[PDB]
Design a protein around this ligand. Structure first.
Ligand SMILES: [Ca+2]
Ligand SMILES: [Ca+2]
Ligand SMILES: [Ca+2]
Lengths: 409, 123
């Protein structure tokens, strides 16, 4: 049976003067109708029965509008999703370009559909489909804490690095390498110049703002807070949002806008660089090797992602937070399988480390577990080679997240 | 939609549906809709060693599949009685959800029961 929404969309398509393309205004009206529909499955069935669903996909032309339409349908449909996907595939004969433009150039149109569909399902299942913002973004453009964690500026949206600087990076000009790398040397000195309130403000800014997502219309309404996504990932991986927050806050203090631009742009350049990207500074090859999107995307979609697509997803905050959390849980589980006798330097640095405790939740870990894991998150894990500075740096971030003024939904 | 995570000594782990009262059973958890409604939903989730009866309908559920059947029988003034029984594999074992409610307006979707099955797991 027709729906109010199917009838409206059919009326608009039937009335449209051109049979190859609806107007931008007509398209925006169809997208709004789809997003406000209380019976999306029935609407999709109706449109597919009349032959109008394929027409809809064929006739909504500019890529930005196609992305909004497709992400909206993918994210709202359940029992009729396959019908929509099929109609979209049928439509692609006459539009090989589809959604595969701008920031989404590494996602084939059906891959875009599948990501949207899987992400919407995961946000509903794991509890991050909606969250009111409780923090506002920084306008910093240089220096420590001027990457996406502070600013909400997606790395994929940053201007192309100036031609002169791209060349210099390729040639390893020392000042330019510096400019586009980690901003901190002396980690303690940096923490020393932040007041206790400055520290809390950074944490609140980080977690309180909306995710910077590449798939906003996959969500029912506005994108959720980072804090919401971190709580969901903590529940999924038997961690705590405080631990996840500490790891990300440390990475983001040691992050700049320019580092974000290099991180992403190098990864999708002809070099396919193996950079650490986004909130948690996840390495491209690690995300692939350890299947770090397992809990947000199904296996067939994941196995089909190109390397540049994976790098692109690491720039979408929710994918990055889940990958970060999954990897923290990987490092902890791996730790639990080690022999402390074969880790004398680790024991020397973290003498109250308890390897078995890692298998359980961080609330029950010795503080030495958190310090050691921080070393083994920045560096290769459990090789008995430690980062001298990262443990204290993460431990201070953790102390901030354990302040009574930090609340997670 | 769901709140607390519940863990059975047999290794079944699941979440409690919001607004339902939970009790532990021999091989899992029983959920009964809260309050004192006329026509409450009732859900049970269990670990089971034996497979489902053969040749049941199949559907996609999350990223695997489930075998299921919905039965109907005479009810009362709130409608016919409907029951879902559905199972999915969990390693060499199975997880089963059964659910019931009445309806006078056709077969219930059992959306809540399907969601509970999807998120259940063994460890
Ligand atoms: Ca960095
Ligand atoms: Ca990096
Ligand atoms: Ca190491």
């Amino acid at each position: 049976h027709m729906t109010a929404t199917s009838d409206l969309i059919e009326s608009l398509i039937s009335y449209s003067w051109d049979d190859w393309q609806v107007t931008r205004q007509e398209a925006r009206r169809v997208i709004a109708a789809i997003r406000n529909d209380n019976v999306p499955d029935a609407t999709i069935a109706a449109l597919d029965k009349s032959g109008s669903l394929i027409k809809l996909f064929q006739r909504v032309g500019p890529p930005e509008l196609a992305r909004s339409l497709i992400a909206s349908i993918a994210g709202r449909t359940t029992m009729q999703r396959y019908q929509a996907r099929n109609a979209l595939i049928r439509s692609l004969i006459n539009n090989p370009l589809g959604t595969q433009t701008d920031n989404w150039i590494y996602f084939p149109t059906i891959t875009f559909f599948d990501i949207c569909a899987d992400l919407a399902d995961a946000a509903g299942r794991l509890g991050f489909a909606a969250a009111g913002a409780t923090g506002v973004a920084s306008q910093a453009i240089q220096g420590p804490f001027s990457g996406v964690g502070a600013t909400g500026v997606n790395p994929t949206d940053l201007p192309s690095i100036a031609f002169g600087d791209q060349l210099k990076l390729l040639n390893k000009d020392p000042a330019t390498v510096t400019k586009y790398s980690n901003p901190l040397g002396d980690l303690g000195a940096y923490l020393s110049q932040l007041s206790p309130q400055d520290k809390l403000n950074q944490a609140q800014t980080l977690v309180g703002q909306p995710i910077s997502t590449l798939f906003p219309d996959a969500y029912p309404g506005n994108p959720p807070s980072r804090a919401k996504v971190m709580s969901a990932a903590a529940r999924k991986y038997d961690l705590t949002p405080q631990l996840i927050g500490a790891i990300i806050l440390a990475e983001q203090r040691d992050q700049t806008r320019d580092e974000d631009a290099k991180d992403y742009q190098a990864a999708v350049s002809i070099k396919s660089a193996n950079t650490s990207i986004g909130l948690g500074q996840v390495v491209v090859s690690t995300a692939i090797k350890y299947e770090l999107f397992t809990d947000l995307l199904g296996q067939p979609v994941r196995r089909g992602l190109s390397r540049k697509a994976v790098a692109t997803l690491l720039a979408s905050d929710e994918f990055n937070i889940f990958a970060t959390a999954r990897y923290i849980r990987y490092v902890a589980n791996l730790a639990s399988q080690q022999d402390l006798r074969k880790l004398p330097k680790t024991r020397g640095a973290f003498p109250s480390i308890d390897l078995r405790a890692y298998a359980g939740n961080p609330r029950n870990w010795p503080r030495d577990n958190v310090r050691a894991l921080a070393s083994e998150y920045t560096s290769r894990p459990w090789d008995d080679n430690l980062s001298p500075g990262w443990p204290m740096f993460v431990d201070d971030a953790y102390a901030t997240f354990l302040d009574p003024g930090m609340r997670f939904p | 939609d769901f709140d607390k995570t519940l863990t059975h000594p047999n290794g079944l782990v699941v979440e409690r549906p919001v607004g339902f009262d939970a009790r532990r059973s021999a091989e899992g958890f029983r959920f009964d809709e809260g309050g004192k409604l006329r026509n409450p939903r009732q859900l049970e989730v269990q670990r089971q060693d034996a497979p489902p009866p053969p040749d049941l309908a199949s559907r996609r559920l999350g990223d695997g599949e489930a075998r299921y059947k919905v039965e109907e029988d005479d009810g009362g003034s709130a409608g016919s009685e409907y029951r879902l029984w559905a199972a999915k594999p969990a390693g060499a074992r199975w997880i089963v959800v059964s659910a019931s409610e009445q309806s006078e307006d056709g077969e219930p979707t059992f959306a809540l029961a399907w969601a509970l099955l999807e998120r259940a797991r063994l460890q």
